[PDB]
Design a protein around this nucleic acid. Structure first.
Ligand SMILES: Nc1ncnc2c1ncn2[C@@H]1O[C@H](COP(=O)(O)CP(=O)(O)OP(=O)(O)O)[C@@H](O)[C@H]1O
Ligand SMILES: [Mg+2]
Ligand SMILES: [Zn+2]
Ligand SMILES: [Zn+2]
Ligand SMILES: [Zn+2]
Lengths: 551, 171, 112, 107, 85, 177, 97, 270
DNA sequence: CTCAAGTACTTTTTCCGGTCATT
RNA sequence: UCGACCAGGA
DNA sequence: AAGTACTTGAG
């Protein structure tokens, strides 16, 4: 888990503070200045360029060598960089909220179009809920098309009282792709509001006013919805797919950043050099496009920013977007170790709470047991049995913290087990295991079972536990999970065990009874005409494992 | 200057020590960590006071490893130096660069130029001295210094002092 | 009276296919849609819009947008929901983790 | 309480909060023909005193938000002239407990 | 300060299914971690089977901190809690 | 690392505290008003050399008693006697506490608890910071000019004759060798 | 095998908290990061062999903790940051309730 | 959807049902605070039947020579006649049973007397008979006081909510309301003596095993009551499709979506 | 300056070998 | 060692 | 497909 001892105290996350990155912070957080669209290859040399993809950042080639931070690959997380944009550009996500904030504040002095003077406004400001308060204030100020100098006083409407200065008509802002256009006024004046324009207006919005809107003085100022300083994610986020030595291969996100950096370098040259004024707006809108397209590529306005192939390009949004997305596909559900799955078969000679585990499966799955004086002697015979005998073990984990592969280790024959060590041993009869059958629409679809190591390649299971799983033996497969803790074992054996699951709370009745052969035969056996002679009766009685011994 | 400070420490025990003499090991552990320590925040944690009434509290068992964590609240004698703080000390080291003075656990180095002009180096002596028209400063001589500044070099604090100002110097 | 009617209708769609569900479960779903003061749909439009954890709500239907508005309005997540702990890889405050376990020295010396 | 026939001028209806501490309530005749509170599905809602309420939140260790809410516009809330923050104790009949009582804070 | 006094406790005097399961697992893990045992292991070797004897004899030295929705809590000893389950 | 008594958190706010001095601006940690074990307000505790030596002695002496309980089933000479107790109650590797106990024994002005408490009653009636109150009990001064130069916090806080009355009572209170 | 969302729900229903954790962490993703106690980000340039911790930008070389989170959660927060969103992780509380 | 809506809802150590915000959904789980596994359908013989048959079944009149408990039912039967003090006890008893009847007929308007409740009382009496080899020949050792006061006292012990205040003690009183109706129905002085034929010994055993069973039957704080409920409605619906007026999956969709324009709006007018 | 209609957006059960191109 | 299509299982 | 959440447009 992250590997190697750290002196830093171990804590649990108790709060998650969402906010926006301020340019100032993006610069401070950054380890490298990222200025070249070229990843690596310091002209031919197979070493990374001091300008993108480790201009200091994370690491490649499994080199501890990671900007003196050492560690490397499994240990060192990524290290963020930055790229200073030539002009400010909108963040795709906040594009609408920027519009809605412009629709609320005077586009000249930055004062809220509505004041404590308007009675409906006082009521909207009284809203406790940050999002509902924003909503009410917007619906109110969108209407106001003038930054009033004076409004009638609370007493007589005859005498007017002066508020925040300047007149100025407010534009009727509308979206046009990734741009904001106004309509001030026979016939109106229609121009595009610049990213810089919006910004200096937002920078002028007072704390009182913007905190009256969704925003937070410390964590999310309205001005931070516009991008000035772009954060460069490290390689662990955008890994380079190497398919030999010579076969370089970089990620999609690496291409888009290089493209932003390509677009930037052009815009900056046009400005810092002979400004052609109307070519600058072209190179500016291109930067806007790329920064947009990198965070979102499933945008309303048709250009899919296709990679020359015919492929669209995975935006950062697309990465997290549910089922397969980082949230639903990587965090709400994961692929797991200590798992097994094979075809299931019905066994009448199994206990309700047992599960037939094929020796193959028992020999691969492992429970890590701590070398305790209680087990010390048994555990040694398992380690000495090795990974090939059935009751055996696969690894010995030392106090030092280092795995011993009994399959190879020159000392596999030896090993004098010290206490406190762990012995990853083959699953044995009566270990608790979580057994399940998909689709798992029940508390009962997953139950804890005792192991019974048997020959032949299927999971054998008692026929009366068929119903809760809703399993048939026409080629159904089932999943097995092996707990690794002595406390996790208890969890299963004490809450999830099959005997416990017998009476179901969804129906207030038992979810498993006698089925098929045993049910058909129980009727046949019962009825008054059925009589059993001594010879057979005695065999019938012996068959009851708890028979009192009384004929 | 020497303070008494009400402090805490989160020690994490291991199940093997969940025996009758647990408190003893925790108290003994607190001392290991805390006593003789030096942080910038509180300075030198010199001695844990009132061993008898050390508060261990109820320790919480951490999930997936039975190890229990206790916030051991306590009280200790600390030494935290400051700028402008006047100290009495003894000379330890002495070179052409100046002389270092031991002030409690900490050392205060007095630069050649943070001394009066008349007081100059004398290499030709065992031990090497700083000689004045009247005074003589050497490896066992007692001094009074003004702490001009502090630095927190890991598990220590070092200061730069002056004996240039009035009422300061040799004692 | 809304709750009454809502339960009545839910109950009958279940009883429609013979199937029996113990009151409490339908009662709970009905109670949930209701407590808010109105009829809260079991959609992204209804439940997923409440004052619950950002990480918890982004775990269903409107993911990236939920998270974007989290930053833009500086949301603070309690980390009280199951979903949040599951994202954080922390022992959820669920059943077995709905309480804390302590060692008492008083009893540790008493048991020897 | 002002009981109108068909309507009231939007001019006239915007004179209701003009006389505090006192309050005004508009009701249409056709709406009042039937006492909706008498219906099968409508349980007994009961207004809680400042102290009754204060005590409830103490005993259930609740913040005002944590309580299930009744809308101000709610037919029964209108019948009892419920004011923002007032709490009603709803006594209903249970197929499970026999009698179960909930509470609703005003909107 | 949140912490209900012994005399003012109001939660089930009985141990929950979830409580017993976490106590039994915790001690099992601890007995396996090479912790000291407050019971006669009468030929016993499985730490859960040991932890069970300890809870049976009510010689488990742990306390459950039952947290209430307002943060306040009640501390109950495994010695205190009734084990009908 | 050892955790404090004060809990005044810095939510995102990077901005750190200003420099420290004898403008009596110590840390946030070393404020005048601070949090007690009971969660009470309590004034900063600052000790002078000798007030500080006796406190450490008291603790280790009663720790040696606790170490002997558990194990059931004159300046030149005060330095050796102290160094013996250290070998018995301290971890040895506490190089700081040895140098400190030597410094305190060879720099303390008042030997006996009586003379220390008398100095404590004398000064703690001026209403000066525990800093000034301790510094006055630490550095031996003759003039109110001497005192007010070295402890430049004092400057307007006390009368020149008043401070000198104390300085001259602290002299008559100084322990011999 | 994929321990699906459905599979998680059953474990919740059961009350197996410590198990759910073992599945999702120990038996998969489980990773260790060093986070800063001022700006709750995975910054901390933690050279472990030397025992140096530091979060430049906060200048803080002291108020640094270590958390255990699923690697994909590390990844998530890094992706959110790349999108100018600050998912600040704090190991204390403020709000109460 | 049902799962993601209900996830975070669980029972807290205060028997209140709350979400991740600590907002109360149910004040007590399923209005009764009982774990659904520990619930069996049981009849309420106070609901149905003629008003005559009821009086036959439960009325004991120690002041009337015909309607007394026969001295073949209990030992005290002979000296019990005319005991105005004990008739006072038996009057409250019956008066409460009549109250009960009115209440139950109020709750279940159709007269349906078979409802799922905790503690299967039948099985407890059924066992007491086979346990104590109850001979339906000899008279009982029980007193009118033994039965009447015994049941009264059992009730005070069927705790769900513990709270020493009055809001909680009233909430306690309320959650048991129906089970007590069932309790008093089944343990009337007449019914215990004439029907069951219980010895004092058996009665104390029945009384303890009701308390015992009841207590176990209550919900456990931590119970993931939220998820449970979602799968309990979910699984049926998912099976009610997998196997080969708007109703079923489409109407359930209508309901959960709080669909405005619904397909079959109807209005039943009485 | 109200309210009808047109505008756009976002969901769609769970787990579990071959062939293509290109990384 | 990367992920898209197609074909399948309960 | 069915909400939502807006613009766009008539009287
Ligand atoms: N598309 C699908 N999605 C989820 N589960 C499925 C599925 N197809 C089949 N199943 C699972 O398989 C179960 C029934 O399918 P089968 O087993 O193939 C029919 P059978 O039981 O063999 O005979 P039958 O046709 O007489 O019922 C379902 O209840 C379900 O659990
Ligand atoms: Mg099948
Ligand atoms: Zn690194
Ligand atoms: Zn203006
Ligand atoms: Zn930081």
């Amino acid at each position: 888990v992250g590997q190697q001892y750290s002196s830093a105290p171990l804590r649990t996350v108790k709060e998650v503070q969402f906010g926006l990155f301020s340019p100032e912070e993006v610069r401070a957080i950054s380890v490298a200045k990222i200025r070249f669209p070229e990843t690596m290859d310091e002209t031919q040399t197979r070493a990374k360029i001091g300008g993108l993809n480790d201009p200091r950042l994370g690491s490649i080639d499994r080199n501890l060598k990671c900007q003196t931070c050492q560690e490397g690959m499994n240990e060192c997380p990524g290290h963020f960089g930055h790229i200073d944009l030539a002009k400010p550009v909108f963040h795709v996500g906040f594009i609408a909220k920027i519009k809605k904030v412009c629709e609320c504040v005077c586009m000249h002095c930055g004062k809220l179009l509505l004041d404590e003077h308007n009675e409906l406004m006082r009521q909207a400001l009284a809203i406790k809920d940050s999002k509902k308060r924003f909503a009410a204030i917007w619906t109110l100020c969108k209407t106001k098309m003038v930054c009033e100098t004076d409004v009638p006083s609370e007493d007589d409407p005859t005498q007017l009282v002066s508020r925040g200065g300047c007149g100025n008509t407010q534009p009727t802002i509308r979206k046009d792709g990734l741009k904001l256009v106004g309509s001030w006024k026979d016939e109106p004046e229609l121009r595009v509001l610049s990213t810089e324009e919006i910004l200096n207006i937002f920078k002028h919005i007072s704390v009182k006013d913007f905190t009256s809107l969704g925003f937070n003085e410390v964590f999310s100022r309205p001005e931070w919805m516009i991008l000035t300083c772009l954060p460069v994610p490290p390689p662990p986020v955008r890994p380079s797919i190497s398919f030999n030595e010579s076969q370089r291969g970089e990620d999609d996100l690496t291409f888009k950043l290089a493209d932003i950096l390509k677009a930037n370098i052009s815009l900056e040259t046009l400005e810092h050099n002979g400004a052609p004024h109307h070519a600058i707006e072209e190179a500016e809108s291109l930067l806007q496009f790329h920064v947009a397209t990198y965070m979102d590529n499933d945008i309303a306005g048709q250009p899919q920013a296709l990679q020359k192939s015919g492929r669209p390009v995975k935006s950062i949004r697309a990465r997290l977007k549910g089922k397969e997305g980082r949230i639903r596909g990587n965090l709400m559900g994961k692929r797991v170790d200590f798992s097994a799955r094979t075809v299931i078969s019905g066994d009448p000679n199994l206990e309700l709470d047992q599960v037939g585990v094929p020796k193959s499966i028992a020999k691969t799955l492992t429970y890590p047991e701590v070398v305790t004086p209680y087990n010390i002697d048994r555990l040694t015979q398992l380690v000495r049995n090795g990974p090939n005998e059935h009751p055996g073990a696969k690894y010995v984990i030392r106090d030092s913290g280092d795995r011993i592969d009994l399959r190879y280790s020159k000392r596999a024959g030896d090993i004098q087990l010290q206490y406190g060590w762990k012995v990853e041993r083959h699953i044995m009869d009566n270990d608790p295991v979580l057994f399940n059958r998909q689709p798992s629409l029940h508390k009962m679809s997953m139950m804890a079972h005792r192991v019974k190591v048997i020959p032949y390649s299927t999971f054998r299971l008692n026929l009366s536990v068929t119903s809760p799983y809703n399993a048939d033996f026409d080629g159904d497969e089932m999943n097995l999970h092996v707990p690794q803790s002595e406390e996790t074992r208890a969890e299963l054996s004490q809450l999830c065990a099959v005997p416990l699951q017998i009476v179901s709370p969804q129906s207030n009745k038992p979810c498993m009874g006698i089925v098929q052969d045993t049910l058909c035969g129980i009727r046949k056996l019962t009825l008054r005409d059925t009589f059993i002679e001594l010879d057979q009766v005695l065999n019938m009685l012996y068959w009851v494992p708890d028979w009192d011994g009384v004929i | 200057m020497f303070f008494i400070k009400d402090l805490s420490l989160n020690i994490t025990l291991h199940p093997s020590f969940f025996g009758p003499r647990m408190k003893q090991y925790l108290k003994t552990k607190l001392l290991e960590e805390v006593e003789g320590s030096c942080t910038g925040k509180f300075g030198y944690i010199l001695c844990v006071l009132d061993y008898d009434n050390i508060d261990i509290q109820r320790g919480r068992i951490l999930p997936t490893d039975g190890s229990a964590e206790f916030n051991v609240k306590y009280r200790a004698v600390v030494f935290k130096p400051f700028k402008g703080e006047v100290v009495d000390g003894t000379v330890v080291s002495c070179s052409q660069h100046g002389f270092e003075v031991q002030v409690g656990p900490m050392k205060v180095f007095v630069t050649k130029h943070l001394m009066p002009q008349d007081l100059t180096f004398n290499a030709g002596s065992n031990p090497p001295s700083y000689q004045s028209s009247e005074d003589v400063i050497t490896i066992k001589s007692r001094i009074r210094v003004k702490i001009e500044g502090c630095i927190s070099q890991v598990s220590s604090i070092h200061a730069i002092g002056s004996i240039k100002e009035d009422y300061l110097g040799a004692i | 009276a809304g709750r009454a009617a809502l339960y009545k209708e839910v109950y009958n769609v279940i009883a429609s296919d013979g199937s029996y569900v113990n009151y409490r479960h339908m009662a709970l779903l009905v109670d949930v849609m209701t407590t808010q003061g109105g009829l809260t749909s079991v959609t992204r439009h209804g439940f997923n819009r409440s004052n619950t954890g950002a990480l918890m709500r982004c775990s269903f239907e409107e993911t990236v947008e939920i998270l974007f508005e989290a930053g833009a309005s500086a949301e603070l997540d309690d980390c009280r929901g199951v979903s949040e702990n599951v994202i954080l890889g922390q022992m959820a405050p669920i059943g077995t983790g709905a309480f804390d376990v302590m060692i008492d020295e008083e009893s540790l010396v008493k048991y020897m | 309480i002002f009981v109108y026939q068909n309507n009231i001028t939007p001019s006239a209806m915007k004179l209701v909060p003009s006389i505090p501490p006192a309050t005004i309530e508009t009701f249409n005749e056709a709406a009042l023909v039937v006492n909706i509170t008498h219906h099968e599905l409508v349980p007994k809602h009961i207004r809680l005193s400042s102290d009754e309420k204060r005590e409830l939140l103490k005993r259930y260790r609740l913040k005002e938000s944590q309580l299930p809410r009744i809308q101000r516009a709610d037919p029964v809330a209108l019948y009892l002239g419920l004011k923002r923050g007032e709490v009603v104790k709803i006594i209903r009949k249970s197929e499970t407990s026999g009698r179960y009582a909930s509470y609703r804070i005003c909107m | 300060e949140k912490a209900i006094p012994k005399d003012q406790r109001a939660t089930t005097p009985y141990m929950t299914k979830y409580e017993r399961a976490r106590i039994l697992g915790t001690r099992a893990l601890q007995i396996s971690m090479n912790a000291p045992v407050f019971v006669d292991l009468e030929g016993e070797t499985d730490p859960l089977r040991i932890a069970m004897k300890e809870l049976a004899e009510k010689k488990i030295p742990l306390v459950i901190r039952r947290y209430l929705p307002d943060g306040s809590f009640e501390d109950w000893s495994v010695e205190e809690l009734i084990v009908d389950l | 690392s050892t955790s404090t008594f004060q809990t005044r958190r810095r939510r995102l706010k990077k901005v750190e505290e200003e420099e420290n001095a004898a403008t009596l601006q110590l840390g946030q940690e070393f404020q005048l008003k601070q949090i007690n074990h009971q969660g009470e307000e309590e004034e900063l505790i600052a000790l002078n050399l000798s007030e500080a030596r006796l406190v450490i002695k008291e603790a280790l002496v009663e720790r040696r008693r606790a170490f002997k309980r558990s194990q059931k089933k004159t300046r030149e000479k005060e330095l050796e006697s102290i160094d013996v107790l250290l070998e018995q109650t301290t971890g040895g590797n506490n190089k700081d506490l040895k140098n400190t106990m030597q410094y305190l024994t060879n720099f303390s002005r008042f030997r006996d608890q009586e003379t220390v408490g008398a100095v404590i009653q004398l000064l703690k009636s001026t209403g000066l910071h525990p800093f000034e109150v301790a510094q006055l009990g630490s550095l031996a001064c003759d003039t109110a000019d001497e005192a007010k130069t070295l402890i430049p916090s004092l400057n307007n806080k006390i009368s020149d004759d008043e401070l000198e009355r104390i300085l001259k009572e602290l002299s008559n209170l100084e322990t011999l060798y | 095998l994929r321990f699906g969302e459905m599979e998680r729900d059953c474990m919740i229903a059961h009350g197996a908290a410590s198990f759910l954790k073992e599945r999702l962490m120990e038996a998969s993703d489980a990773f260790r990061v060093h986070i800063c106690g001022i700006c709750g980000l995975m910054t901390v340039i933690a050279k472990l062999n030397h025992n140096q911790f530091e979060c430049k930008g906060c200048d803080n070389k002291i108020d640094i903790y270590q958390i255990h989170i699923p690697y994909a959660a590390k990844l998530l927060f890094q992706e959110l940051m790349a999108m100018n969103i600050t998912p600040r992780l704090y190991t204390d509380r403020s709000r109460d309730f | 959807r049902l799962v993601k809506a209900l996830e975070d809802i669980m029972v807290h150590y205060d028997n209140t049902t709350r979400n991740s915000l600590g907002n109360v959904i149910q004040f007590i789980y399923g209005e009764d605070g009982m774990d659904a596994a520990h619930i069996e359908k049981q009849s309420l013989d106070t609901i149905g039947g003629s008003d005559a048959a009821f009086e036959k079944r439960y009325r004991v009149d120690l002041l009337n020579t015909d309607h007394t408990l026969d001295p073949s039912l209990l030992e005290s039967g002979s000296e019990i006649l005319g005991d105005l003090k004990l008739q006072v006890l038996l009057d409250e008893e019956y008066k409460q049973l009549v109250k009960d009847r009115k209440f139950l007929r109020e709750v279940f308007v159709d007269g349906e007397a078979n409802w799922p409740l905790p503690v299967n009382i039948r099985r407890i009496i059924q066992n007491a008979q086979q346990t104590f080899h109850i001979d339906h020949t000899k008279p009982s050792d029980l007193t009118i006081k033994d039965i009447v006061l015994g049941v009264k006292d059992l009730q005070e012990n069927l705790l769900v909510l513990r709270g020493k205040n009055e809001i909680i003690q009233n909430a306690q009183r309320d959650a048991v309301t129906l089970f007590c109706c069932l309790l008093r129905s089944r343990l009337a002085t007449r019914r215990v003596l004439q029907e069951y034929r219980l010895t004092k010994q058996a009665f104390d055993w029945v009384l303890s095993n009701i308390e015992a069973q009841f207590l176990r039957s209550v919900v456990h704080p931590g119970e993931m009551v939220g998820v449970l409920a979602a799968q309990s409605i979910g699984e049926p619906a998912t099976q009610m499709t997998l196997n080969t007026v708007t109703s079923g999956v489409p109407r359930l969709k209508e309901i959960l979506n709080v669909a405005k324009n619904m397909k079959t709006p109807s209005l039943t007018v009485y």
